[PDB]
Ligand SMILES: *[B@-]1(O)O[C@@H](C#N)c2ccccc21
Ligand SMILES: [Cl-]
Ligand code: NA
């Protein structure tokens with residue numbers, strides 16, 4: 232309401248297109264802004280790839296220990312962990328951690344490959360009840376974020392509801408859900424995004440995304456002090472192909488929607 236006016240002003244100031252969905256699990260309420268529009272997920276899609284592997288591991292519990300070769304031919308444009316393991320192997324657990332905690336693009340590609348490709352990550356989403364998410368490309372091209380292009384997009388509403396299912400619901404088994412949350416709480420890449428708009432005492436598990444057109448995203452499960460958890464998706468994209476990242480916009484959106492909680 233007033234929060235709606237504040238998000239609209241933030242969007243206006245920012246010069247881009249802002250998408251927000253907050254779920255407050257205390258009362259099952261939502262704050263939504265462009266929450267049914269599509270946005271390029273960029274690296275926030277790494278959550279869904281890792282979750283698809285975790286789901287597969289429920290019925291193949293040795294899956295996370297399976298070794299995957301890292302070759303020079305696997306390197307792409309952002310390989311902080313994988314580059315250190317070239318000519319060796321990483322387990323699917325290590326690749327999941329690398330994708331979620333360091334945003335490693337080789338790791339993402341290995342997760343995608345294992346489950347069967349981008350369309351298999353999408354099928355996992357569908358099987359959960361998310362009929363909006365679509366993963367269509369591998370790294371690095373899934374981050375082009377061209378205006379009007381539906382590839383590799385979802386909506387804030389759908390991603391918030393799915394993140395809630397994965398982290399606070401029981402889409403995943405007890406061990407797998409705990410593992411996803413632990414991985415997201417150990418993210419090294421999120422302190423300037425949603426977390427920067429929340430009090431220091433609050434605990435956050437998040438995954439950021441960056442891409443073309445200044446696309447700057449974050450999805451988070453939040454444990455506020457002495458309150459039930461929140462789910463927050465903040466997606467942002469800009470009109471210029473070479474626009475700079477705007478993590479401050481995500482921090483501001485997070486501050487706006489959590490004011491009073
Ligand atoms: B994600 O959008 O893809 C990676 C690249 N390039 C990356 C690095 C750091 C944060 C988010 C992402
Ligand atoms: Cl504080
Ligand atoms: Na989604």
Ligand code: NA
Nearest residue numbers: 421425426437
């Ligand atoms: Na964050």
